[PDB]
């Protein structure tokens, strides 16, 4: 794949249909599971471990679907969805490096939610710091993640793990 | 609250509206974020640590919203939603014990996904084992959770943490 440092919302939507990295590359979820609007920076070096970095953003507005049901009369973006965005970015990066296969989240170490995303916020920022990448027969990524809302850190996740699989018959 | 050992779909829908545990108890998310169809068992003793146990189920059918977008052409229930159902059950239990306040997931320690939920599955079972409950004027619940698909253990989550809050304007 020809690597770009950033991707637009249109690119992320093309990705969900497998039109970005080709038919062998991984796909990002499509709405309403897509949890980012754009990827503002992607590098092979950099990040807290100098092994890779990804920064993405999600624009917030009061009308996003999840505010209406989580919860009724007490809108707050589900934490699980910010967490999924992080898994999505780790998997996307693996595909960006040329990894082939279907994306499947494998797990995460500690996750801490210290703040919330309200319908009055404006922008959610995701930062992924890669600590390890296996791109041999097996394609797997390990990273730490940070979620900020309007420049303030609210969630951290250690050891997000995602792999790409050509055969998912054993799951 | 007048504890019942089990709750039906209609009870969970009333919960999302704030009718089940009253105006001061926690609310479950409403569809499309409600991740269970019923709670089959709730006991304050029992469970792996004999400090509480809850078992719930989610009926699976190909038409569930998430199957159409995650991923297009490769349907699999998002692992993040299975995690949310477990946080949802921990908070529901704190309200069941009589706790007052709005539920907020605080984090989780370690999550491992070893299997997937396909649209061909029939049922997902959630089993929550409580470790510690602080129901003082600081309501928090700590528990380990397991997710099974048609009886097969596929996800384990250690140290799920949820708390109920009177005032959430601090986050
Ligand atoms: C959507 C679904 C899952 O990953 S379900 C995880 C099941 N795990 C196993 C081992 O079967 C989340 C997709 C995140 C990764 C997207 C990569 C582009
Ligand atoms: C929906 C939203 C969240 O919990 S967002 C977490 C934000 N964290 C803080 C500290 O503000 C999930 C609700 C799960 C618990 C429901 C209990 C009934």
Dihedral pair phi/psi, residue B145, rounded to 5°: -135, 155
Pairing of strands A152-165, A102-108: antiparallel
Q: Nearest by CB to B171, which of A34, A71, A115?
A: A115
Breaks in chain B after (C-N > 2.5 angstroms):
none
Q: Do A104 and B116 touch (CB under 8 A)?
A: yes
Question: Tokens in use for B66?
Answer: 């998430």
Residues of A in contact with B27 (CB under 8 A): 71-74
Give me the domains of chain A, ranges plus CATH numbers. Answer: 1-171 (3.10.129.10)
- C-alpha distances (whole Å) from B78 to each of A124, B85, B117 are 21, 11, 8
Q: Give the resolution in Å.
A: 2.0
Burial B153-165 (b: 16+ CB within 10 A, else e): ebbebbbbbbbbb
Of the partner residues A17, A68, A113, the one whose CB lies closest to the CB of residue B72: A17
The C-alpha atoms of residue A109 and residue B69 are separated, in whole angstroms, by: 26
B142: which residues sit within 8 A by CB, 6+ positions away?
Answer: B130, B131, B132, B133, B159, B160, B161
Helix, strand, coil abundance in chain A, percent, nearest 5: 20, 35, 45
A167 CA to middle of ligand 2, Å? 35
Interface of A with B in 67-106 (CB under 8 A): 68-74, 76, 78-81, 83-84, 87, 102-106
CA of A80 to the centre of ligand 2 (A): 9
Q: Where are the beta strands (DSSP E) in chain A?
A: 38-43, 53-59, 102-108, 111-113, 123-135, 139-149, 152-165
Torsion of CA A126, A69, B102, B45, to 10 degrees: -100
State how far residue B140 is from chain A, nearest Cα, in angstroms: 14
**What DSSP line would sit under A49-77, residue for residue?**
TTS-EEEEEEE--TTSGGGGTTTTTS---
Q: Residue B124 in contact with residue B79, Cβ under 8 Å?
A: no
Q: Which two tokens stand for residue A130?
A: 């890669």
A124 part of contact set with chain B, CB < 8 Å: no
Token digits of residue B132: 């510690």
Among B87, B156, B62, B71, which Cα is nearest to A106's? B156
Using a CB-CB cut-off of 8 Å, the residues of chain B touching A153 are none
Per DSSP, the three-state class of B15 is helix
| DSSP secondary structure code for residue B117 in this structure | -
Technique used by the depositors: X-ray
CB contact under 8 A, B33 and A171: no
Q: What is the largest CA-CA distance in chain B?
A: 49
């Amino acid at each position: 794949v020809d690597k770009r440092e950033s991707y637009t919302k249109e690119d992320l939507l093309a990705s969900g249909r497998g039109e970005l990295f080709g038919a062998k590359g991984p796909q990002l979820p499509a709405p309403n599971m897509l949890m980012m609007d754009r990827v503002v920076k992607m590098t092979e070096t950099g990040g807290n471990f100098d092994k890779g970095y990804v920064e993405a953003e999600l624009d917030i507005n009061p009308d996003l679907w999840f505010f209406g049901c989580h919860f009724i009369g007490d809108p707050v973006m589900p934490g699980c969805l910010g967490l999924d965005a992080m898994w999505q970015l780790v998997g996307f990066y693996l595909g960006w490096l040329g990894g082939e296969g279907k994306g499947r989240a494998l797990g995460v170490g500690e996750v801490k939610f210290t703040g919330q995303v309200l319908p009055t916020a404006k922008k959610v920022t995701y930062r992924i710091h890669f600590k390890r990448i296996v791109n041999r027969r097996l394609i797997m990524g390990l990273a730490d993640g940070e979620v900020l809302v309007d420049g303030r850190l609210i969630y951290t996740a250690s050891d997000l793990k995602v792999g790409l699989f050509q055969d998912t018959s054993a799951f």
